[PDB]
Design a protein around this ligand. Structure first.
Ligand SMILES: COCCNc1nc2ccc(C#CC3(O)CCCCC3)cc2n1-c1ccnc(N)n1
Length: 292
């Protein structure tokens, strides 16, 4: 389709193996292989993600990533820098911070409520910004949270991103990762930005239990469980403070009406007991030691 030509008018022109040097593969997933690099001038280090378009197309969401992200900059988001197309590959240039994913922290260490509150505050800030600009991430999970060496928190991977409008402020595309999905998305009801709030809630369960509910099961079985069970239950709910349990239940409220939004969840008292972001850095050290 001309959808490839629409993409050819968005990207920049260049080698682009002339500016950016010092390539190192630091990742490889469904979003494509990710490299670290640096362009002459400099001294800015960058991350370059590479998709094989003529080997694993989609392909409407590909363009949607660039368009939505290039005009939505925020401190709590990995920021788009540029994009090129070479051969069959699409390259996306973005900021880089070193220091692992939240996933490595939540599956190899234990976070206290002060640390969970700091991570949640930063995430809510990114969501509150996205939602105020009619943007829904639709794939909130620890895998998509990045941790700076100074304890910074950045939302990443907007490949499943979606833009709403007052004329059609809801969606019905069954997108995201099964276990982190809101019920209204699982059961194909019309859904809004509050689905990000849900997945944030599931990600808190990660930070509490080390993994999202039903993870032992299979993706489809999980979707069924989410559909049936609705609001998931902690193995040991008593291990959480009263101010934390209230926070979770306002993130995981079945009633989309009664479920909190990012703007009002930033006002929750659970975020008041938040520790400074520097407390997250020993978790990063510990995460890297179990990773070895
Ligand atoms: C946790 O994985 C470590 C490997 N790094 C990595 N994989 C990525 C996949 C997709 C995107 C992505 C993406 C976007 O959707 C974000 C909005 C702008 C367009 C591209 C970014 C990835 N990164 C980064 C990026 C920057 N720093 C670090 N440490 N890792």
């Amino acid at each position: 389709e001309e959808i490839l030509e629409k993409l050819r008018s968005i990207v920049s022109v260049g080698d682009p193996k002339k500016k950016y040097t010092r390539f190192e593969k630091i990742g490889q997933g469904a979003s494509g292989t990710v490299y670290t690099a640096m362009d002459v001038a400099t001294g800015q280090e960058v991350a370059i993600k590479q998709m094989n378009l003529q080997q694993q197309p989609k392909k409407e969401l590909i363009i949607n990533e660039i368009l939505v992200m290039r005009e939505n900059k925020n401190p709590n988001i990995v920021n788009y820098l540029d994009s090129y197309l070479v051969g069959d590959e699409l390259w996306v240039v973005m900021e880089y911070l070193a220091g692992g994913s939240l996933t490595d922290v939540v599956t190899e260490t234990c976070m206290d409520e002060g640390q969970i509150a700091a991570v949640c505050r930063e995430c809510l800030q990114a969501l509150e910004f996205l939602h105020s600009n009619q943007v829904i991430h639709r794939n909130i999970k620890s895998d998509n949270i990045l941790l700076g060496m100074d304890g910074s928190v950045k939302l990443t991977d907007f490949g499943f991103c979606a833009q709403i409008t007052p004329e059609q402020s809801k969606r019905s595309e069954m997108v995201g990762t099964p276990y982190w999905m809101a019920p209204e998305v699982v059961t194909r009801k019309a859904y809004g930005p509050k689905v990000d709030i849900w997945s944030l809630g599931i990600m808190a369960i990660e930070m509490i239990e080390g993994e999202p509910p039903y993870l032992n099961e299979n993706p489809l079985r999980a979707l069924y469980l989410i559909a049936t069970n609705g609001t998931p239950e902690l193995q040991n709910p008593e291990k959480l403070s009263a101010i934390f349990r209230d926070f979770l239940n306002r993130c995981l409220e079945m009633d989309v009406e009664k479920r909190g939004s990012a703007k009002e969840l930033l006002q929750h008292q659970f975020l008041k007991i938040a520790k400074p972001l520097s407390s997250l850095t020993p978790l990063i050290a510990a995460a890297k030691e179990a990773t070895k």
